[PDB]
Amino acid sequence: FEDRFDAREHKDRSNKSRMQAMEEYIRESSDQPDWSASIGADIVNHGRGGIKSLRDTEKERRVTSFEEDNFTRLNITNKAEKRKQKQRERNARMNVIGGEDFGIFSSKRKLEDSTSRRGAKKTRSAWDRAQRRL
Amino acid sequence: GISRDSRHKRSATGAKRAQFRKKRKFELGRQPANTKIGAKRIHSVRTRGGNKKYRALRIETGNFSWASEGISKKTRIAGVVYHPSNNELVRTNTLTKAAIVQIDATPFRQWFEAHYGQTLKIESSVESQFSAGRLYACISSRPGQSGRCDGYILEGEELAFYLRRL
Amino acid sequence: QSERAFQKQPHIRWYKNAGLGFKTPKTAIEGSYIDKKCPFTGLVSIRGKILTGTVVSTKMHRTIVIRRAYLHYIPKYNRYEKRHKNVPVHVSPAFRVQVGDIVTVGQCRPISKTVRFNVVKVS
Amino acid sequence: AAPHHWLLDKLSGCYAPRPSAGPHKLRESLPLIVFLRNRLKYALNGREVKAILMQRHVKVDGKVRTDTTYPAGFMDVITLDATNENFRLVYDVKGRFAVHRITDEEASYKLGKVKKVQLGKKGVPYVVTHDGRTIRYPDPNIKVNDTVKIDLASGKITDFIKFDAGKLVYVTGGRNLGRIGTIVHKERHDGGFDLVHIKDSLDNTFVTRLNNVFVIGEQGKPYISLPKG
Amino acid sequence: NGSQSIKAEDEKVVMPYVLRIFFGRAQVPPTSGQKRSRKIAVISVLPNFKKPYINDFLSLASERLDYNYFFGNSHQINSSKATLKTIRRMTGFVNIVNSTLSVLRTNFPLHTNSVLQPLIYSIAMAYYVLDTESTEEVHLRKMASNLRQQGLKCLSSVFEFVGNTFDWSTSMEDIYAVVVKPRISHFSDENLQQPSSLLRLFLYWAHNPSLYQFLYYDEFATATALMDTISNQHVKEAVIGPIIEAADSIIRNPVNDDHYVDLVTLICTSCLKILPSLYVKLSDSNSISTFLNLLVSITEMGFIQDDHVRSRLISSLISILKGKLKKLQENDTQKILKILKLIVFNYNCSWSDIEELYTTISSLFKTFDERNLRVSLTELFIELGRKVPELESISKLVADLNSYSSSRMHEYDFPDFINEKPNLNEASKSISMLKDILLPNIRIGLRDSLEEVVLSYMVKNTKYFTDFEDMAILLYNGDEEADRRQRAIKRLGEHAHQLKDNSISHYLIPMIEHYVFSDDERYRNIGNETQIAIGGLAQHMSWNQYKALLRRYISMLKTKPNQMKQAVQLITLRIVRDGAESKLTLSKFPS
RNA sequence: UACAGUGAAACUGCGAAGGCUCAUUAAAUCAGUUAUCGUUUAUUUGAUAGUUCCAUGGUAUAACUGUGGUAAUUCUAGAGCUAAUACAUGCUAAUCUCGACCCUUUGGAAGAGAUGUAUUUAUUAGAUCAAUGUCUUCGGACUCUUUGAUGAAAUAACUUUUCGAAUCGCAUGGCCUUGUGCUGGCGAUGGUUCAUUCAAAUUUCUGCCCUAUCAACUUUCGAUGGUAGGAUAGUGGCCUACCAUGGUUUCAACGGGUAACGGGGAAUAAGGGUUCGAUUCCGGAGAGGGAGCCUGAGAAACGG
């Protein structure tokens, strides 16, 4: 019919097909090193936390880099923290053993049905599959 | 009037079960203040900020134009004979738009005698009324929105155009 | 062509070119018609967007009820349901429209309660 | 609540500033608070951004115009005196607000899409732009969606860049806020899906709306510079 | 209080005549000075006194515009306004050059004269001034320097007052007193006299009948000066004739023509000046042109010569008799000039009008045979009548055809001036063949056949009124001459005229093939008929534009083929309009 | 010894500029979108004011004083003055063109036409020619050819008619009219109109329930349309006279629901919680209850 602007139609979602299994394989077979920390500085409340998860240290890198990039300490906004921080530490202490999370193997999410088996370039003709192979 | 909206009266499909809303400001369905004959008295109604609006009630000084020369001169008002947007309008003899009212036309007469000299190119169906004095004239400006009595005299075609009807 | 009262006269006979792909007939340019609400002269102004379609009913004067079927590849039942629409439209003396008779019209200046369109071109 | 064009990160606060009345629109403007504060970061917060707007360093549209929610929209030539920060701001390929740095040469001018030419009163020729540049006495061939060039010291239309076939286009609208290249086709309808279509690196073809579009220059020579990468 | 003053002057008319005259006498006596100025001149005034008479004139002008029926006219008010004009003249003239109060008093003088002349405009044949001598004396003392001073396209103080004095019968006492027409004719016969000179001549024409009808010998001498002014400013009425009113010049020439006809030079100039409306432009009116032609003949019957005036009237007769409009009215004027040019060739023009124009019977059909048996050698009016009967006319069609064939034989009998007349016959025959003519285009083709007497054999093959095998033979004969810009354009336009897209028969596609094949055979000539192919392909573009899109499309598609063959044989040119034509077709493509 | 710093009570400029409870509204709520030359628009922003006849305009009234009434309120009665950016009356240079004449370059004197805005009435300005060429007569009649252009608000009046600076600052500054004689360079606010922004209301289109034991509906708040009047911010059957018998639907009209405390992309997404999980609004009102008025760029006012 007619044209409508849509940020959700050209927005970086990029989280509907990130799976820790695939990213773990890519990190194993990347042949570029991965910027691990010094081995003590990653555990948190003298051990009373976990070590900390990989999602946790990338989010923490983002928070401190945003901190050092526009000069602002965050807050104690209570509705937000009373949901997300207590739920974050509770799923961390249920699933994350030794700094590695194991909830990805005990949760239903189909790996092939969002991450592999490409959708646009599905090659729905034999001519297309022969050309794209060769 | 009360409002100006397609909610309380039905659409072309005749739907039911209205219970729509309680009426707001912008449907200010004002009272019609019909102008009549008297001495000039107007109401300056207030709307939409500093929007004054003159509702004419007893204006008499008719500004009517000789149409074949476009001369807007200043006369009186006698009475309507035809306005069937309501059949009560000719009976009660109000004053509104598109009304043909009779006028003693001595300013038009003296403008003719001041540009011409001779007393009485033009229709005899207006020459008998120049001999008379009382002419027919249609008001086009809105007494309820502009607040004056401005119109055009009838000369020939428009005179007979209202005369064959009545 | 003078049936109703109150000095049927033009408004300032006077004529105008509607244009924009809509040719005005010469009889409507200089004829005897009052040309009160045609898009060619009228007093209205044409604007907005244009629609196309055949008609069904032209029983009242200055009413043209235009039928509009449009196609849409519906993926719900994976099939098509046939579209139909209706809306009255004012006259303009170009070709007197009976049952059928595709017309294109354009958005303009509300006249009665359900019309914003007035005929410009017939085929 | 906060719009996509300003690149407001969600780590901002709670309330987003509604930009006030001015030259530009609501959806097609970023105010000077979100410009200086968290886009190129010359102030840290509201207190010191009002402090620099009361210190009055800015010369957007060649005037000071001291207010935080002053809607400095598309291609309002920002000029800041301390180390000659000269910025003409455009859209990028995803709808946001890019800020292309210019010099004083390019900062001595700008353009404007015309929106109507009317004969209002006293027979005076008439042209208004997106930023309301009511400028006097052009050639009479200022067509619809044409482009004038603003002197930024005076107001006078010094150059005139026509909306017609074979000119480099801009688009502010559709699903395509801000693409460049303008040559596959001119498909002109009479009010809807009516446009000059745009290319790509593989020369694709796109559909936009007519008043959501203006002309920036010519294909192979725009003097109004574009960034790279 | 300005709008209150407008109201005052508006409702100052509900009083009576006695009240109006008493109010006017009260208004006059505030600034009268009548003990000091109503004899000769004003004795003393100040800025304050010159403003009181200025506002007296201001109220006088507003009262004139309000009551322009009588204005309460009075001798005391006239003497007071004369005193005001004389006081303003004295102050502005002998006051030294400071220009401020002098400029105020010079504005007050023009506006005060406007307050005076409005009485002469609105109270013209009601005032009947018998006391005009003193005011006319002061008027000559004011406008004695107005020779060309009040002469321009918009200077209208003395111009308007002199027009008010001139455009009546009995107002000319001040014209016959000393001088009016002197200033009027000076302003008319100025060297660069501007577009009010037509109105100055209009006032002189409106005053000339007054100077005729008045019982004074001074008015008779004024009419003598009127004839002398019309004969002295004859180029003013030509240099100021850029407007549509040539009927006014015709009606001033006829009135002066019924007044007097003086000399051979006057007859020469008047013949050339009424002839200018037949030999300068075509945008004159119907009765204007007929009256100008009859007045040119009425001066030629007055004082014309034998050779030059005969040449002017003979060129007029040759133009207007082959024009022949206005239902024999302009032809009647042409016949009057034809008999009145007074020569042997004029006698031949009179005979060729007399035998042929006897009122819509077989009279022209008898005169065609009479001229074919007794054709003369003046032949201007005869060729005019033999081209006018050759035109889109009803009667004497084949008679005009036979007249043209004997005319070509007479061209071969005289053989170079009668071959120079054939150039005019050719340039008129192309103009008749490029039209909607049926009998006249076929007779023009018969004139082509008689002038070309294989070509004439193919012409006799084509002229058979069958036009399927005949048009195929025309295509085959054109191809035989293939295996001439205007001549090939004439043959192609004759093909397109006999096949002019008229949808009432078939084989129009083969007829278009014939026309485009003749165009291509001319298009092989790349050095001479290149402009012919250019005009023909541009006309095919214009026919693809002008409301016909099914014939001229194939015509342009065939027109491009000789272009592509000539470009293939080229293997520079004007490709600018070619890219324009490609762009025009691309404009038509998506539309 | 006509004003002088704190300073109890008043007006002004501004402020409160956005929140409880109850019955259950199915693309009519709501969203996206076109338009408004159909329209109201404070504010922001851009432009944009020439009609003067024989040294600066009058009282009414607060605060202030004084006498009192009442059980008594931001309840009141007489009497007295006093000034306003309060009422309301009146003071204000000669400047724009066509240029008879020229004396040649420093070129402009004579005559003539002049000069705003707002409210509503009427005629109206809004078919020509120039070349690169048909004929070249090495001259021209030239728009049918090749293109190119002004182009298919000026006038005659109404009206209890608005104003042409009583705002402030930076700057002693110029010229001898023998003194504030002429002041004069500059900036913001003024101020009519138009545009723009924002906002408001109407407007075409687009958007997941079952639906025929809901098949006929709509003239029983006019049903559908014209013409005209009213009034509206205006168009508009939005109300009124007269006139036509309309208009929709089986291609699903109109009509009946819950998990319409749940839904409509309304939207944050959270790197694994696979419909839990972030947010806009349930519908519309009410300030004891209906009724009637007023205020304002915006109100049928949360506070008249």
Coordinates of N, CA, C and O in Angstrom, one line a residue, chain E residues 49-151:
Chain E
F49 N -2.7 82.4 3.8 CA -3.8 82.8 2.8 C -3.8 81.8 1.6 O -4.9 81.6 1.1
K50 N -2.7 81.4 1.2 CA -2.7 80.4 0.0 C -3.2 79.1 0.4 O -3.6 78.3 -0.4
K51 N -3.1 78.7 1.7 CA -3.7 77.5 2.2 C -5.2 77.6 2.3 O -5.9 76.6 2.1
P52 N -5.7 78.8 2.6 CA -7.2 78.9 2.8 C -7.9 78.8 1.4 O -9.0 78.2 1.4
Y53 N -7.3 79.4 0.4 CA -7.9 79.2 -1.0 C -7.7 77.8 -1.5 O -8.5 77.3 -2.2
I54 N -6.6 77.1 -1.0 CA -6.3 75.7 -1.4 C -7.4 74.8 -0.8 O -7.9 73.9 -1.4
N55 N -7.7 75.1 0.5 CA -8.8 74.3 1.1 C -10.2 74.6 0.6 O -11.1 73.8 0.7
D56 N -10.4 75.9 0.2 CA -11.6 76.3 -0.5 C -11.7 75.5 -1.8 O -12.8 75.0 -2.1
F57 N -10.6 75.3 -2.5 CA -10.7 74.5 -3.7 C -10.8 73.0 -3.4 O -11.4 72.3 -4.2
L58 N -10.3 72.6 -2.2 CA -10.4 71.2 -1.8 C -11.9 70.9 -1.5 O -12.4 69.9 -2.0
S59 N -12.5 71.7 -0.7 CA -14.0 71.5 -0.5 C -14.8 71.7 -1.7 O -15.8 71.1 -1.9
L60 N -14.3 72.6 -2.7 CA -15.0 72.7 -3.9 C -14.9 71.5 -4.8 O -15.9 71.1 -5.4
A61 N -13.7 70.8 -4.8 CA -13.6 69.5 -5.5 C -14.4 68.4 -4.9 O -15.0 67.6 -5.6
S62 N -14.4 68.3 -3.6 CA -15.2 67.3 -2.9 C -16.7 67.6 -3.1 O -17.5 66.7 -3.3
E63 N -17.1 68.9 -3.1 CA -18.5 69.2 -3.4 C -18.9 69.0 -4.9 O -20.0 68.6 -5.2
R64 N -17.9 69.1 -5.8 CA -18.1 68.8 -7.2 C -18.4 67.3 -7.4 O -19.3 66.9 -8.1
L65 N -17.5 66.4 -6.7 CA -17.7 65.0 -6.8 C -19.0 64.5 -6.1 O -19.6 63.6 -6.6
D66 N -19.4 65.2 -5.0 CA -20.7 64.8 -4.4 C -21.9 65.3 -5.2 O -22.6 64.6 -5.8
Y67 N -22.0 66.7 -5.3 CA -23.1 67.3 -6.1 C -22.5 67.8 -7.4 O -22.3 68.9 -7.7
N68 N -22.2 66.8 -8.3 CA -21.9 67.0 -9.7 C -23.2 67.2 -10.6 O -23.1 67.1 -11.8
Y69 N -24.3 67.5 -10.0 CA -25.6 67.8 -10.7 C -25.7 69.3 -11.0 O -26.1 69.6 -12.1
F70 N -25.5 70.1 -9.9 CA -25.5 71.6 -10.1 C -24.3 72.2 -9.6 O -23.8 73.2 -10.2
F71 N -23.8 71.7 -8.4 CA -22.7 72.2 -7.6 C -22.9 73.6 -7.1 O -22.0 74.3 -6.6
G72 N -24.2 74.1 -7.1 CA -24.5 75.4 -6.6 C -23.8 76.6 -7.2 O -23.3 77.5 -6.5
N73 N -23.7 76.6 -8.5 CA -22.8 77.4 -9.3 C -23.2 78.9 -9.2 O -24.4 79.3 -9.1
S74 N -22.2 79.8 -9.0 CA -22.5 81.2 -8.7 C -21.3 82.0 -9.2 O -20.1 81.5 -9.2
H75 N -21.6 83.2 -9.7 CA -20.6 84.1 -10.2 C -19.6 84.6 -9.1 O -18.5 84.8 -9.4
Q76 N -20.1 84.7 -7.9 CA -19.2 85.1 -6.8 C -18.2 84.0 -6.5 O -17.0 84.2 -6.3
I77 N -18.6 82.7 -6.6 CA -17.7 81.6 -6.4 C -16.8 81.4 -7.6 O -15.6 81.1 -7.4
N78 N -17.2 81.8 -8.8 CA -16.3 81.7 -9.9 C -15.3 82.8 -9.9 O -14.1 82.5 -10.2
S79 N -15.7 84.0 -9.4 CA -14.7 85.1 -9.3 C -13.7 84.8 -8.1 O -12.6 85.1 -8.2
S80 N -14.2 84.1 -7.0 CA -13.4 83.8 -5.9 C -12.4 82.7 -6.3 O -11.2 82.7 -5.9
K81 N -12.8 81.7 -7.1 CA -11.9 80.7 -7.6 C -10.9 81.2 -8.6 O -9.7 80.8 -8.6
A82 N -11.3 82.2 -9.4 CA -10.4 82.9 -10.3 C -9.4 83.7 -9.5 O -8.2 83.7 -9.9
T83 N -9.8 84.3 -8.4 CA -8.9 85.0 -7.5 C -7.9 84.0 -6.9 O -6.7 84.4 -6.7
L84 N -8.4 82.8 -6.5 CA -7.5 81.8 -6.0 C -6.4 81.3 -7.0 O -5.3 81.2 -6.6
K85 N -6.9 81.1 -8.2 CA -5.9 80.7 -9.3 C -4.9 81.8 -9.6 O -3.7 81.5 -9.7
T86 N -5.4 83.1 -9.6 CA -4.5 84.2 -9.9 C -3.5 84.4 -8.7 O -2.3 84.7 -8.9
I87 N -4.0 84.2 -7.5 CA -3.1 84.4 -6.3 C -2.1 83.3 -6.2 O -0.9 83.5 -5.9
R88 N -2.5 82.0 -6.6 CA -1.5 80.9 -6.6 C -0.5 81.1 -7.7 O 0.7 80.8 -7.5
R89 N -0.9 81.6 -8.9 CA 0.0 81.9 -9.9 C 1.0 83.0 -9.6 O 2.2 82.9 -9.8
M90 N 0.5 84.1 -8.9 CA 1.4 85.2 -8.5 C 2.4 84.8 -7.5 O 3.6 85.1 -7.6
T91 N 1.9 84.0 -6.5 CA 2.8 83.6 -5.4 C 3.9 82.6 -5.9 O 5.1 82.7 -5.6
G92 N 3.4 81.6 -6.7 CA 4.3 80.6 -7.2 C 5.3 81.2 -8.3 O 6.4 80.7 -8.4
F93 N 4.9 82.2 -9.0 CA 5.7 82.8 -10.1 C 6.7 83.8 -9.6 O 7.9 83.7 -10.0
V94 N 6.3 84.7 -8.7 CA 7.3 85.7 -8.2 C 7.9 85.3 -6.8 O 8.7 86.1 -6.3
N95 N 7.5 84.2 -6.3 CA 8.2 83.7 -5.1 C 9.5 83.1 -5.5 O 9.6 82.4 -6.5
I96 N 10.6 83.3 -4.7 CA 11.9 82.9 -5.0 C 12.1 81.4 -4.8 O 11.2 80.8 -4.3
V97 N 13.2 80.9 -5.3 CA 13.3 79.4 -5.4 C 13.7 78.9 -4.0 O 14.9 78.7 -3.7
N98 N 12.7 78.6 -3.2 CA 12.9 77.7 -2.0 C 12.3 76.4 -2.2 O 12.7 75.4 -1.5
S99 N 11.3 76.3 -3.1 CA 10.6 75.1 -3.6 C 9.7 74.4 -2.6 O 8.8 73.6 -3.0
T100 N 9.7 74.8 -1.3 CA 8.8 74.1 -0.4 C 7.4 74.7 -0.4 O 6.5 74.0 -0.8
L101 N 7.3 76.0 0.0 CA 6.0 76.6 -0.2 C 5.6 76.9 -1.6 O 4.4 76.8 -2.0
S102 N 6.6 77.1 -2.5 CA 6.4 77.1 -3.9 C 5.9 75.8 -4.5 O 5.0 75.8 -5.4
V103 N 6.4 74.7 -4.0 CA 5.9 73.4 -4.5 C 4.5 73.1 -3.9 O 3.7 72.5 -4.6
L104 N 4.2 73.5 -2.7 CA 2.9 73.4 -2.2 C 1.9 74.2 -3.0 O 0.8 73.8 -3.3
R105 N 2.3 75.5 -3.3 CA 1.4 76.3 -4.1 C 1.3 75.9 -5.6 O 0.4 76.3 -6.3
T106 N 2.3 75.1 -6.1 CA 2.2 74.6 -7.4 C 1.4 73.3 -7.5 O 0.7 73.0 -8.5
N107 N 1.3 72.6 -6.4 CA 0.4 71.5 -6.2 C -1.1 72.0 -6.0 O -2.0 71.5 -6.6
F108 N -1.2 73.1 -5.3 CA -2.5 73.8 -5.1 C -3.0 74.4 -6.4 O -4.2 74.6 -6.5
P109 N -2.1 74.8 -7.3 CA -2.5 75.4 -8.5 C -3.1 74.4 -9.5 O -4.2 74.6 -10.1
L110 N -2.5 73.2 -9.6 CA -3.0 72.1 -10.4 C -4.3 71.6 -9.8 O -5.3 71.3 -10.5
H111 N -4.4 71.4 -8.5 CA -5.6 70.9 -7.8 C -6.7 71.9 -7.8 O -7.9 71.6 -7.9
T112 N -6.3 73.2 -7.8 CA -7.3 74.3 -7.9 C -7.9 74.4 -9.3 O -9.1 74.6 -9.5
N113 N -7.1 74.2 -10.3 CA -7.6 74.2 -11.7 C -8.4 72.9 -11.9 O -9.4 72.9 -12.7
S114 N -8.1 71.8 -11.1 CA -8.9 70.6 -11.2 C -10.3 70.9 -10.5 O -11.3 70.4 -11.0
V115 N -10.3 71.7 -9.5 CA -11.5 72.1 -8.8 C -12.4 73.0 -9.8 O -13.6 73.1 -9.7
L116 N -11.7 73.8 -10.6 CA -12.4 74.6 -11.6 C -12.9 73.9 -12.7 O -14.1 74.1 -13.1
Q117 N -12.1 73.1 -13.4 CA -12.4 72.3 -14.6 C -13.5 71.2 -14.4 O -14.2 70.8 -15.3
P118 N -13.6 70.8 -13.1 CA -14.7 69.8 -12.8 C -16.1 70.4 -13.0 O -17.0 69.7 -13.3
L119 N -16.2 71.7 -12.8 CA -17.5 72.4 -13.1 C -17.7 72.4 -14.6 O -18.8 72.2 -15.1
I120 N -16.6 72.5 -15.4 CA -16.8 72.5 -16.9 C -17.0 71.1 -17.3 O -17.5 70.9 -18.5
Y121 N -16.7 70.1 -16.5 CA -17.0 68.7 -16.9 C -18.4 68.2 -16.5 O -19.0 67.5 -17.3
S122 N -18.8 68.5 -15.3 CA -20.0 68.0 -14.7 C -21.2 69.0 -14.9 O -22.4 68.6 -14.7
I123 N -20.9 70.2 -15.2 CA -22.0 71.2 -15.3 C -21.9 71.8 -16.7 O -22.0 73.1 -16.9
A124 N -21.5 71.0 -17.7 CA -21.1 71.5 -19.1 C -22.2 72.2 -19.8 O -22.1 73.4 -20.0
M125 N -23.3 71.5 -20.2 CA -24.4 72.2 -20.8 C -25.5 72.5 -19.8 O -26.7 72.3 -20.0
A126 N -25.1 73.1 -18.7 CA -26.0 73.6 -17.7 C -25.6 75.0 -17.2 O -26.5 75.8 -16.9
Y127 N -24.3 75.3 -17.2 CA -23.8 76.5 -16.7 C -24.1 77.7 -17.7 O -24.7 78.7 -17.2
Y128 N -23.7 77.5 -18.9 CA -23.9 78.5 -20.0 C -23.3 79.9 -19.6 O -24.0 80.9 -19.5
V129 N -22.0 79.9 -19.5 CA -21.2 81.1 -19.0 C -21.3 82.2 -20.1 O -20.8 82.0 -21.2
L130 N -21.8 83.3 -19.7 CA -21.7 84.5 -20.5 C -20.6 85.4 -20.0 O -20.1 86.3 -20.7
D131 N -20.2 85.3 -18.7 CA -19.1 86.0 -18.2 C -17.8 85.2 -18.2 O -17.3 84.7 -17.2
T132 N -17.2 85.0 -19.4 CA -16.1 84.1 -19.6 C -14.8 84.9 -19.9 O -13.7 84.2 -20.0
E133 N -14.9 86.2 -20.2 CA -13.8 86.9 -20.8 C -12.6 87.1 -19.8 O -11.5 86.9 -20.2
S134 N -12.9 87.5 -18.5 CA -11.9 87.7 -17.5 C -11.2 86.4 -17.2 O -9.9 86.3 -17.1
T135 N -12.0 85.3 -17.0 CA -11.4 84.0 -16.7 C -10.6 83.4 -17.8 O -9.6 82.8 -17.6
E136 N -11.1 83.7 -19.1 CA -10.3 83.2 -20.2 C -9.0 84.0 -20.4 O -8.0 83.5 -20.9
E137 N -9.0 85.3 -20.0 CA -7.8 86.1 -20.0 C -6.8 85.6 -19.0 O -5.6 85.4 -19.4
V138 N -7.2 85.3 -17.8 CA -6.3 84.7 -16.8 C -5.9 83.3 -17.2 O -4.8 82.9 -16.9
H139 N -6.8 82.6 -17.9 CA -6.4 81.3 -18.4 C -5.3 81.3 -19.5 O -4.4 80.4 -19.5
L140 N -5.4 82.3 -20.4 CA -4.3 82.4 -21.4 C -3.0 82.9 -20.7 O -1.9 82.5 -21.1
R141 N -3.2 83.8 -19.7 CA -2.0 84.2 -18.9 C -1.4 83.1 -18.1 O -0.2 83.1 -17.8
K142 N -2.2 82.1 -17.7 CA -1.6 80.9 -17.0 C -1.0 80.0 -18.0 O 0.2 79.6 -17.8
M143 N -1.7 79.5 -19.0 CA -1.2 78.5 -19.9 C -0.6 79.1 -21.2 O -0.8 78.4 -22.3
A144 N 0.0 80.2 -21.2 CA 0.6 80.8 -22.4 C 1.9 80.0 -22.7 O 2.4 79.9 -23.8
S145 N 2.5 79.4 -21.6 CA 3.7 78.6 -21.8 C 3.4 77.1 -21.9 O 4.4 76.3 -21.9
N146 N 2.2 76.8 -22.1 CA 1.8 75.4 -22.3 C 1.6 75.0 -23.8 O 0.6 74.7 -24.3
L147 N 2.8 75.1 -24.5 CA 2.8 74.7 -25.8 C 3.0 73.1 -25.9 O 2.1 72.4 -26.4
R148 N 4.1 72.6 -25.3 CA 4.4 71.2 -25.1 C 4.6 70.9 -23.6 O 5.0 69.8 -23.3
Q149 N 4.3 71.9 -22.8 CA 4.5 71.7 -21.3 C 3.5 70.8 -20.8 O 3.8 69.8 -20.1
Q150 N 2.2 71.0 -21.1 CA 1.1 70.1 -20.7 C 0.9 69.0 -21.8 O -0.1 68.4 -21.8
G151 N 1.9 68.8 -22.7 CA 1.9 67.8 -23.7 C 2.7 66.5 -23.3 O 4.0 66.6 -23.3

